[PDB]
Design a protein around this nucleic acid. Structure first.
Ligand SMILES: Cc1[nH]n(-c2nc3c(Cl)c(Cl)ccc3[nH]2)c(=O)c1[C@@H]1OC(=O)c2ccccc21
Ligand SMILES: [Zn+2]
Length: 357
DNA sequence: AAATTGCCGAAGACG
DNA sequence: CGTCTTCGGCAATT
């Protein structure tokens, strides 16, 4: 039953080939345009991230995430109030003349200024693309992405995300996050935390507006690693090991949410990241591969559901990397919204998920 | 050195 | 199930 649903969600290789060919062409051309001189972004390097590259994209290969990461040496972070996730960015000394100087607000590196120039460069390069139907989506306030819309003729969206790369130790708000010590282990956790961390230009929302200069942490690289390396046993899902159902559970939950969001606009505040965060917590709670045997799929999905419902009820979903940051706080999502989603999930749960059709 | 190449894991396709 | 395939990621190579 869930097996038949998984069959429907599975991407098709011909669809993948057609989409990847086009997306790869467009991204490679923008990355190159960025390498151009003058460009304040000259040293940017590409990191593919998100559902498609984690192999948990469902239904159709029509959404691609790509981080353009820029190593910016020696920056100081100032936590924006007590959020743990959002920061003001300053440069330590003064780099004689360096080209991020235009994006400065005196001493602070404005996320909005830098993203605006990045978007402008992308829009200009896109207008010069003639062999492919592609346009830039209208700017979305408080979004770090420049979103491309490709018609292949199928509709494909590509989010291009500027990221600042910093090689220093991770901000202390993350010190008790990534609780993978009983699952993936201490050597993995330590090695993951020696990797760079990233800032993307998503502005903090304080009230009815955004704080234009704030940046937000991103662990898209770390999450991608975990999805590809998700077993307590090193051979989990390898050719000489045993298949588990962890990723299939994630797909089913993404599907349930997406089907619900598509017909109820009361759910606009939710997104796949909430589901991804929930299952990260589930994998920490139930680390044994034996707990995610494919024969147990139904019970794993149900336990994920029970857990997600408890998060909604209690208005608490801790960010997996930043435990202080509650994704389900009143400030971010209204009570009413969480109770609406609770009633809809419970109904689908007790009626055999009719919405899976 | 910016672009090419090689290798192989993940997973879709098929019987 | 096994086998065969393509795509993505990496980094040595030129
Ligand atoms: C609600 C939400 N939070 N969230 C998210 N918040 C993140 C935080 Cl705070 C850190 Cl530190 C790292 C990654 C994070 N991802 C998201 O990525 C989203 C969704 O991504 C969006 O841009 C978005 C937009 C509308 C609804 C949901 C989301
Ligand atoms: Zn596995």
């Amino acid at each position: 039953k869930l097996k038949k649903v998984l069959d429907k969600l599975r991407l098709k290789r011909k669809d993948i080939s057609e989409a990847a060919e086009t997306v790869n062409k467009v991204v490679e051309r923008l990355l190159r345009r960025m390498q151009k001189r003058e460009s304040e972004f000259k040293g940017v390097e590409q990191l593919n991230t998100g559902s498609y590259y984690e192999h948990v994209k469902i239904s159709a290969p029509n959404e691609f995430d790509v981080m353009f990461k820029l190593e910016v040496p020696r920056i100081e972070l100032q936590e924006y109030y007590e959020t743990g996730a959002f920061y003001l960015v300053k440069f330590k000394r003064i780099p004689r003349g360096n080209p991020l100087s235009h994006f400065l607000e005196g001493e602070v590196l404005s996320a909005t200024k830098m993203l605006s120039k990045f978007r402008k460069i992308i829009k200009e390069e896109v207008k010069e693309i003639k062999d492919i139907d592609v346009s830039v989506e209208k700017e979305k306030p408080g979004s770090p992405a420049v979103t491309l819309l490709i018609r292949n003729p199928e509709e494909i969206s590509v989010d291009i995300i500027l990221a600042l790369e910093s090689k220093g130790s991770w901000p202390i708000s993350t010190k008790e996050g990534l609780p993978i010590q009983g699952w993936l282990g201490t050597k993995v956790r330590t090695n993951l935390r020696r990797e760079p961390f990233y800032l993307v230009p998503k502005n903090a929302k304080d009230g009815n507006s955004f704080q234009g200069e704030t940046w937000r942490l991103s662990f898209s690289h770390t999450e991608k690693y975990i999805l590809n390396n998700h077993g307590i046993e090193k051979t989990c899902c390898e050719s000489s090991g045993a298949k588990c159902c962890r990723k299939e559970c994630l797909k089913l939950m993404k599907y349930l949410l997406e089907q619900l969001k598509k017909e109820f606009q009361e759910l606009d505040a939710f997104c796949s990241y909430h589901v991804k965060t929930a299952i990260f917590h589930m994998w920490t709670q139930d680390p044994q591969d034996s707990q995610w045997d494919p024969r147990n799929l139904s019970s794993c999905f149900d336990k994920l559901l029970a857990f997600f419902l408890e998060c909604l009820r209690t208005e608490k979903l801790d960010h997996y990397f930043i435990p202080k940051f509650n994704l389900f706080s009143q400030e971010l999502i209204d009570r009413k919204s969480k109770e609406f989603l609770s009633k809809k999930i419970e109904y689908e749960r007790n009626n055999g998920f009719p919405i899976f059709d």
